Design an enzyme around this catalytic site. Sequence first.
Site, PDB file in Angstrom:
ATOM      1  N   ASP A 138       0.837  -1.192   0.000  1.00 43.50           N
ATOM      2  CA  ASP A 138       0.000   0.000   0.000  1.00 43.50           C
ATOM      3  C   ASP A 138       0.876   1.248   0.000  1.00 43.50           C
ATOM      4  O   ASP A 138       2.012   1.233   0.480  1.00 43.50           O
ATOM      5  CB  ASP A 138      -0.930   0.001   1.215  1.00 43.50           C
ATOM      6  CG  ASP A 138      -1.847   1.211   1.249  1.00 43.50           C
ATOM      7  OD1 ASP A 138      -2.823   1.246   0.471  1.00 43.50           O
ATOM      8  OD2 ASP A 138      -1.590   2.128   2.057  1.00 43.50           O
ATOM      9  N   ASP A 151       0.013   8.928  -8.602  1.00 45.34           N
ATOM     10  CA  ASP A 151      -0.865   8.527  -9.694  1.00 45.34           C
ATOM     11  C   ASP A 151      -2.002   7.660  -9.171  1.00 45.34           C
ATOM     12  O   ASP A 151      -2.319   6.608  -9.735  1.00 45.34           O
ATOM     13  CB  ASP A 151      -0.081   7.798 -10.784  1.00 45.34           C
ATOM     14  CG  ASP A 151      -0.864   7.661 -12.076  1.00 45.34           C
ATOM     15  OD1 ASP A 151      -1.964   8.244 -12.174  1.00 45.34           O
ATOM     16  OD2 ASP A 151      -0.377   6.969 -12.996  1.00 45.34           O
ATOM     17  N   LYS A 202      -1.941  13.494  -9.246  1.00 41.41           N
ATOM     18  CA  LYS A 202      -3.074  13.533 -10.156  1.00 41.41           C
ATOM     19  C   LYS A 202      -4.369  13.648  -9.367  1.00 41.41           C
ATOM     20  O   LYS A 202      -4.594  12.906  -8.408  1.00 41.41           O
ATOM     21  CB  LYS A 202      -3.107  12.280 -11.033  1.00 41.41           C
ATOM     22  CG  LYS A 202      -4.312  12.207 -11.965  1.00 41.41           C
ATOM     23  CD  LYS A 202      -5.378  11.256 -11.458  1.00 41.41           C
ATOM     24  CE  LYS A 202      -4.954   9.812 -11.645  1.00 41.41           C
ATOM     25  NZ  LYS A 202      -6.014   8.882 -11.179  1.00 41.41           N
TER      26      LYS A 202
END
EC number: 2.1.1.-
Lengths: 132, 225, 114, 35, 239
Positions: free
Chosen positions: E3, E28, E68
Amino acid sequence: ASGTKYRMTLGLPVQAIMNCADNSGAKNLYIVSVFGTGARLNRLPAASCGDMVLATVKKGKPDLRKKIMPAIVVRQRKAWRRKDGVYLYFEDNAGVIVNPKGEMKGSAITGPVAKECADLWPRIASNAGTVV
Amino acid sequence: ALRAQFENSNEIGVFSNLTNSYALVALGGSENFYSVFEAELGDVVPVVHTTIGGTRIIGRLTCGNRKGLLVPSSTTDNELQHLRNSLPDPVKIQRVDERLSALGNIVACNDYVALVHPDIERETEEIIADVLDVEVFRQTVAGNVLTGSYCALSNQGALVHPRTSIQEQDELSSLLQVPLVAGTINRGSDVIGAGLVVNDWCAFAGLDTTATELAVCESIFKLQD
Amino acid sequence: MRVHTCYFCSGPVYPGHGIMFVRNDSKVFRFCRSKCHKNFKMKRNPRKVAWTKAYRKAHGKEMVYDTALAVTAARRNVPVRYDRNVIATTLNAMKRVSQVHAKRERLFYKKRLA
Amino acid sequence: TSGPRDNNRNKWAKKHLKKGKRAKNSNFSKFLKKK
Amino acid sequence: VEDITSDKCRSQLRGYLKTWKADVVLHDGAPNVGSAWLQDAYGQAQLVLMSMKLACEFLVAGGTFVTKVFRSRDYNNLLWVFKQLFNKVEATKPPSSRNVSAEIFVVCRGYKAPKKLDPRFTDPRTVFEEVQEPVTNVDAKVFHPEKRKRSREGYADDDYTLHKTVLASEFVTANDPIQILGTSAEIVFPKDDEECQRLYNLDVTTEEILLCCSDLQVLGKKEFRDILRWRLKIRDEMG
RNA sequence: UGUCGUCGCAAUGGUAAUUCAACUUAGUACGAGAGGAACCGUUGAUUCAGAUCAUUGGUAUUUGCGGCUGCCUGACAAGGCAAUGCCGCGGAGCUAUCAUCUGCCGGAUAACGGCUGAACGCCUCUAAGCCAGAAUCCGUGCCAGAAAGCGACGAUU
RNA sequence: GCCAAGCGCGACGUUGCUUCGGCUCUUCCUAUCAUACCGAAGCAGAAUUCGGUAAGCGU
RNA sequence: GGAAGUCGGCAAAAUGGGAAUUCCCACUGUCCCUAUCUACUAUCUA
């Protein structure tokens, strides 16, 4: 779910934003999917009073939002005919946030409760204040 | 205490109402549920196979005690007359024109003292005092206005949320002049009024109520003997 | 089986006929027809609408009250035990009240015309 | 679930017919018939 | 292969970081599609914020964070948090990023290097708390009994009983009758209040006005105007 | 088929219903416990099909009624107007899983389970025979009616 | 390669590592996902797995 | 109900607006799911 549910006019299709009636803190419920929808071609799934649908909390606490998780409609704008023959319609499209078992996540509700929703869901009727 | 179930629903409090002078059960459903109540109270108090407003939620729609019974204004005239024929004369029956038709959900009343919804109307409170002949307190149970559903109230015992503080517990018991216990029913179902109905000599719990919970309600209610 | 009274027209509403509308205040508005329902929707005042009973009541065009036969009807929230003789007498009482109420319905119109 | 041409269901429908169900129907015809 | 923000991976990142400190971070985070856009938009935004959490934990002063984000209503709030926690904001769309979608790359350069990560910033409830707007245009509802414009915000912010009542004395004395009529279901006239008793006995008050106050909701524009003129006349009478 | 009409016959052709979860049987069979069936019976709901307009919604050329704006008769009123000027209501009709009704029974089989029973003095569901058995098959029912299929009946220029 | 019934091959076995592309639509096929019925399995029950009949009906 | 239609807010209604092609808000028969009305066309006649 307890007991069979009579068919009534559908007025809450998918892609609908609706008012969230409990005290859990959620404000707007966004309908994404409807349980018990058959394979009908080019048909928008729709919801009615007492029907359980996948709803997303648009407005409310950040924590309970981001959970596509079932909601029971408690008030419907579109007029529907009860089997006694009379026609009913509520000013607002109100729903309650519920777990799959059938228990409301919140502790209390606001606004009138449709009787068809109340008889279908005993926990909702237990947590209901005004069943009209 | 007895474990009973309406169809596959353990919230017998929703589908039935229990008092110290009569019993109320739904209409048109499974006859087993009515027979379960009859086996324990048929020879004691009359049992009424009735529905309210064409609904099976008469337990949480109706509020009353051994002397009197209240139904919401939405109750049909045919249902109102049917209740009077079935119920004995010493049991008064009265309609309530209230903004909150869920009288059972908003008022938790025993034979002598009643706790009502904080927003209950003054006229409704006057009618409750006249018919129920009980002292009416306008308070809340565990910070939740639905006292009738979140509190199971009897003559010798009361049950409320497990989340209530000790001082709130003691204050409520002192106001209700009755022993009171903070607990849960039906294996974690915190709506005791929906999952439990108790008279002054017997109690009825859902079929999913744990044995520990069953032992607890029997002890507080002192109905073992 | 209750024949309700429309909120707007104050007329007789029978099963099937008209619409029932529930407000957030749990208050119930029953409409005898679409015309009355839409008039509620534009929120016109019944006493100010020329053809409503409320207008005809609070404009001197209809009687304040009639205690014909000392009683006509009432909203009884206390149920009554059945009795064949009682249910007989009220039925005869009902037509007697209607006939007398019809009698005053005529004299008063003569009074207004005069 | 099976349809209306289910052979077992047609067997059960006969068992309803071979009892008072068709019976109630016969004398009900006889009443209006002797009228 | 773990993770992004796990306690173990954070230990591994600091294990490799040692005397060095994080200079630039790329993000991302991409939730899967197949649900509500608002769900996917907030799923990305929360994952950006919760990944932005590890950044401030590991970032050096003047560091850069390129992440992002999916444009949404919470996007403005996310930029606000970026502005306080970084010196410069460089939200931009590269030519390669598809224009039809909402993939926006926000470059948060010049790390503020705070003394400690603010608990309000850490907690998503506080960060994405819905900020109230100016008073709703209730005057339009008063002036227009029509125009059913699909009002859908909530239920008066946890108001259990929607039949809100306003004292006759309070309604007359208040300087904002337009918002009273728009919000209150009725103007109550309790018999206990001595001023309300005066209001009944006032000659200006009429039976129509009493009926109008009893049911404010079933009232047209003209009836509301008459009530507004009535309360002004009562105000002129008192002073 | 004298002629016309009424009432039918039915060769043949098409076909239609589908699925789900709720009650009871149950918290029983079964299970250390965890859990937890099914048949009969019953109620609803999906998809589809055939209709229907009592109620509800929609519709407005009923240009039906009322209101508003403007125009024309010197004025008042009176009217009439304006490519259907604008607004509200609006029957009737049409219409909507936006409203409501209805949606059937016999055998014969496949897989498979057997009965008797040789072949092969035993045995064997198979050879000759015979039962049970699938949403299958063929009928029934429903739709059409051969415009070169037909019957009975009525009257007779 | 080893065998190898047999007729120099030699079957089954055994060793050796290794432009295209997709919406609607009409029907039809079964090489069947579901629905109906059976068979088998440590298949207690429940939920399954596998295998048959099966294109009526959906997908 | 409100862009779920379609490769897509094309056309309408909104007035279109706000913020950075996108997002938010509003709007609507684009869609669920079509229904009704009008004139013309279409039809027949000389």
